[PDB]
Amino acid sequence: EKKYRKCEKAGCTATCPVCFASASERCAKNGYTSRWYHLSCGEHFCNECFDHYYRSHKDGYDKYTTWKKIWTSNGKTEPSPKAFMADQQLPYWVQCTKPECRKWRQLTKEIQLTPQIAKTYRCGMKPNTETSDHCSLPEDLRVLEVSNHWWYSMLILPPLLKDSVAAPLLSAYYPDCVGMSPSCTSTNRHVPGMNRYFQPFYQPNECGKALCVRPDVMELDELYEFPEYSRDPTMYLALRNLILALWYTNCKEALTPQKCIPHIIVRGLVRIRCVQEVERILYFMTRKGLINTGVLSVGADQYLLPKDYHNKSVIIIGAGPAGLAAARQLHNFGIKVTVLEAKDRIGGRVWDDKSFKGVTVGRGAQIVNGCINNPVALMCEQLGISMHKFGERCDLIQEGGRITDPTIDKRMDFHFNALLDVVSEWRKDKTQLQDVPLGEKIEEIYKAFIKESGIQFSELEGQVLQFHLSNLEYACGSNLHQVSARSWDHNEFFAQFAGDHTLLTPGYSVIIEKLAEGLDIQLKSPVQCIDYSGDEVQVTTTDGTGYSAQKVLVTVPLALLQKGAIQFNPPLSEKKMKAINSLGAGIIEKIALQFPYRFWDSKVQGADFFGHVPPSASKRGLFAVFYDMDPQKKHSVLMSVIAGEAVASVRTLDDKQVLQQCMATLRELFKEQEVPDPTKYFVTRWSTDPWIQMAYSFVKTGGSGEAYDIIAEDIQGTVFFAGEATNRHFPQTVTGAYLSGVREASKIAAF
Numbered sequence: 001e002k003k004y005r006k007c008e009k010a011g012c013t014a015t016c017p018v019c020f021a022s023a024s025e026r027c028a029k030n031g032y033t034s035r036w037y038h039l040s041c042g043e044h045f046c047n048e049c050f051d052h053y054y055r056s057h058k059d060g061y062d063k064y065t066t067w068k069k070i071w072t073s074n075g076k077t078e079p080s081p082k083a084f085m086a087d088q089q090l091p092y093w094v095q096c097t098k099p100e101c102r103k104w105r106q107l108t109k110e111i112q113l114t115p116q117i118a119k120t121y122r123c124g125m126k127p128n129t130e131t132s133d134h135c136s137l138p139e140d141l142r143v144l145e146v147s148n149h150w151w152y153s154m155l156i157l158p159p160l161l162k163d164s165v166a167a168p169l170l171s172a173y174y175p176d177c178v179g180m181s182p183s184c185t186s187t188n189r190h191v192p193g194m195n196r197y198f199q200p201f202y203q204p205n206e207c208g209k210a211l212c213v214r215p216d217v218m219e220l221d222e223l224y225e226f227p228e229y230s231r232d233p234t235m236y237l238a239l240r241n242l243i244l245a246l247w248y249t250n251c252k253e254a255l256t257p258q259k260c261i262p263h264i265i266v267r268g269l270v271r272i273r274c275v276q277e278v279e280r281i282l283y284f285m286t287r288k289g290l291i292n293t294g295v296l297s298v299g300a301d302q303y304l305l306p307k308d309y310h311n312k313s314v315i316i317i318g319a320g321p322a323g324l325a326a327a328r329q330l331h332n333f334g335i336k337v338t339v340l341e342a343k344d345r346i347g348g349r350v351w352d353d354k355s356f357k358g359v360t361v362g363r364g365a366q367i368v369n370g371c372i373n374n375p376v377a378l379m380c381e382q383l384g385i386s387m388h389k390f391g392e393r394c395d396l397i398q399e400g401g402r403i404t405d406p407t408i409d410k411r412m413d414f415h416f417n418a419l420l421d422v423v424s425e426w427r428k429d430k431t432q433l434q435d436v437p438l439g440e441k442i443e444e445i446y447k448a449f450i451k452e453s454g455i456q457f458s459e460l461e462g463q464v465l466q467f468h469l470s471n472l473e474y475a476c477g478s479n480l481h482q483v484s485a486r487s488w489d490h491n492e493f494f495a496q497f498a499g500d501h502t503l504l505t506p507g508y509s510v511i512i513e514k515l516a517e518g519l520d521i522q523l524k525s526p527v528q529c530i531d532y533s534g535d536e537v538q539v540t541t542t543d544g545t546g547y548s549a550q551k552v553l554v555t556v557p558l559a560l561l562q563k564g565a566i567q568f569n570p571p572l573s574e575k576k577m578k579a580i581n582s583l584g585a586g587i588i589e590k591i592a593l594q595f596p597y598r599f600w601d602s603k604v605q606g607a608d609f610f611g612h613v614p615p616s617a618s619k620r621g622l623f624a625v626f627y628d629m630d631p632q633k634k635h636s637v638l639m640s641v642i643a644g645e646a647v648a649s650v651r652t653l654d655d656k657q658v659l660q661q662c663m664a665t666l667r668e669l670f671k672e673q674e675v676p677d678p679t680k681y682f683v684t685r686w687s688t689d690p691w692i693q694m695a696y697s698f699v700k701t702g703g704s705g706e707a708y709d710i711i712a713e714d715i716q717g718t719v720f721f722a723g724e725a726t727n728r729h730f731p732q733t734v735t736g737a738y739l740s741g742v743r744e745a746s747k748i749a750a751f
């Protein structure tokens with residue numbers, strides 16, 4: 001039998017392979033063997049130790065055969081002596097936890113690495129236990145080899161993590177397909193204590209859930225950033241999944257490399273590569289706003305990105321959700337940020353009234369549509385505040401006081417949705433130039449349906465159909481004759497936020513105020529001119545005050561871009577202006593009313609809301625739904641909404657006149673009983689608020705959902721745009737505005 005002292009692998013860098021296993025009595029140690037089996041450039045085992053586990057007549061056979069059965073029934077990865085060695089016998093490596101040392105040390109071969117050892121190890125210490133003489137000793141020369149790409153090229157098998165925090169969430173997958181060891185009994189065993197709104201991973205073959213990630217497939221931007229994992233994403237996926245599991249396990253503190261490291265358990269020098277890589281992936285995911293986000297705050301010298309990203313300055317225009325999200329992100333990253341806000345307050349279309357006894361009443365936004373993976377739900381968790389999931393019951397009460405039978409409600413809802421299905425079919429073969437107003441198409445289809453079918457609706461059924469029409473006008477922010485039939489629901493092409501629809505009972509202002517805390521925000525500083533013709537951006541407010549920065553982020557409402565209230569030099573492009581003008585500045589208003597007692601309790605019986613059947617088409621959208629603003633049923637505040645054509649009818653009414661129409665409406669809805677006078681109220685005027693002039697965007701006839709992407713496109717890597725009218729997947733909402741700010745901070749930090 002011929003024996004060799006060199007590695008089996010052509011080009012291996014080990015000039016003298018030594019056996020890490022020493023499992024056989026005849027282990028070749030550092031000498032000659034019939035084959036030196038290669039795991040990495042630094043790790044080899046001799047043929048005697050190979051046979052020790054592999055051959056049926058040898059001592060190690062039962063342990064290998066036992067491992068092999070577990071491996072093949074739990075994973076898709078082939079068993080082999082090399083796979084066994086890497087999973088069960090290869091020694092562990094650990095970093096000294098002395099902060100000024102951090103050197104990599106090999107543990108003796110019977111020590112099994114735990115998070116506790118990784119948190120407490122110091123050079124030369126017996127694991128699980130004075131002078132720093134041992135720290136000065138050089139690292140094993142194989143340690144430095146690991147930081148080269150060629151070392152990864154020469155590693156024969158991907159690493160497989162043990163006891164990953166992500167494993168309880170991934171039991172539907174083969175563990176090795178997500179970078180976890182099939183032999184782990186804890187991996188192969190609702191995550192207790194994890195917020196039920198945090199569902200970061202798609203289940204197999206699952207789609208259609210906003211902000212979920214496939215645990216078994218890399219996304220294109222991950223591959224662009226880490227092309228070394230394109231052939232085999234195993235090792236990247238385990239680290240990214242681990243990072244996400246750790247972040248959602250404790251979203252109230254910054255997830256750092258040092259916090260991840262004890263949770264990376266895997267044998268061999270590859271652990272060094274895993275620890276180096278998890279730090280790079282963490283910064284990539286931090287920049288993108290996937291972790292270390294929300295209302296997390298850092299102190300100075302505790303910034304979330306390394307000093308490389310810090311050498312920038314930004315001016316942010318507008319302190320609503322999008323602007324404050326960008327400002328918080330960039331500030332946390334370590335980038336200089338100044339926020340210029342036109343009004344005397346922050347929040348934009350978030351504006352909460354705190355003067356009603358016992359409740360908080362939003363003048364603007366207050367609902368969260370779809371809490372699962374929603375950053376608003378994350379921020380509620382971070383702040384320790386609760387949302388109220390809406391109940392389904394909403395009786396449609398008529399003027400005169402009768403309650404509409406629920407089968408009428410459902411039947412006319414059925415007919416209305418069927419009208420929308422015909423629009424959905426009609427538009428399939430239509431170009432933008434062939435677009436038609438949604439409301440016009442609905443009316444045409446309805447009239448054809450009546451003529452064709454001969455059906456005769458009662459007056460009440462027709463009024464209930466008007467109710468459902470007004471709900472769609474509310475959702476679009478407009479009468480439907482301005483809304484695109486092709487594009488009105490364009491964003492539903494994309495995965496939407498699943499789960500509960502809630503009332504944010506403490507109000508979005510709590511989140512707004514925490515985002516803004518400690519930031520440099522200039523109030524009463526409306527921007528008039530943005531000049532990016534020079535080496536730095538020059539921003540001038542209406543009183544002549546100048547600000548400068550390398551980059552500028554514009555988050556003003558769609559209506560203010562349409563009016564051109566800010567002059568741009570050089571001007572916005574024709575293509576950008578066409579997109580801006582293709583979207584509609586939708587609008588609703590709100591009224592809130594406080595009463596001496598809950599006069600509606602006997603009739604409404606604890607429902608979250610009740611509907612108002614419009615008595616005529618001229619009154620469609622006028623107080624269509626009344627919201628009980630105390631889910632705990634103690635205080636007496638109702639809120640109602642003005643939508644569609646009704647917005648134009650209240651434009652020329654003062655607040656007292658609107659209040660009078662609302663009280664006359666309520667006394668009709670509760671005709672059979674007494675209704676007390678309200679003791680406090682507000683009527684919103686968003687449509688004439690000079691720096692807002694809207695509630696939320698929609699696509700106008702002839703427009704495309706692509707307009708949202710076009711408005712979001714940066715100019716020259718210098719002028720950036722965020723805001724609800726820049727979020728194609730998630731238009732209109734505080735959530736989409738927030739995410740658009742996170743998106744732009746990511747773009748800005750990448751330079």
Ligand SMILES: [C]C1=C([C])[C]=C2C(=[C]1)N([C][C]([O])[C]([O])[C]([O])[C]OP([O])(=O)OP([O])(=O)O[C][C]1O[C](N3[C]=NC4=C3N=[C]N=C4[N])[C]([O])[C]1[O])C1=NC(=O)[N]C(=O)C1=N2C(=O)[C][C]C1=[C][C]=C(Br)[C]=[C]1
Pocket residue numbers: 317318319320321322323340341342343346347348349350363364365366367368369525526527528555556557560565566588589590684686691692694695696722723724725732733734735737738
């Ligand atoms: C108004 C309203 C109402 C009444 C209601 C509601 C609403 C609203 N919503 C919406 C929201 O809110 C929005 O979207 C947001 O807020 C947005 O954000 P942004 O984008 O950030 O914006 P703003 O806020 O507006 O902010 C901006 C700012 O900027 C400023 N400026 C301007 N200009 C200027 C300035 N500065 C300086 N310079 C210059 N020049 C202004 O001032 C401002 O501040 C909503 N949302 C949600 O999410 N939720 C709710 O609840 C809401 N709402 C209602 O109610 C309903 C609606 C909806 C829902 C659901 C869905 Br799916 C959709 C929709």
Ligand SMILES: [Zn+2]
Pocket residue numbers: 019020021022023024026027028029045046047048049
């Ligand atoms: Zn050996």
Ligand SMILES: [Zn+2]
Pocket residue numbers: 007008009012013014017037038039040041044
């Ligand atoms: Zn080798």
Ligand SMILES: [Zn+2]
Pocket residue numbers: 096097098101102103122123134135136
């Ligand atoms: Zn040390």
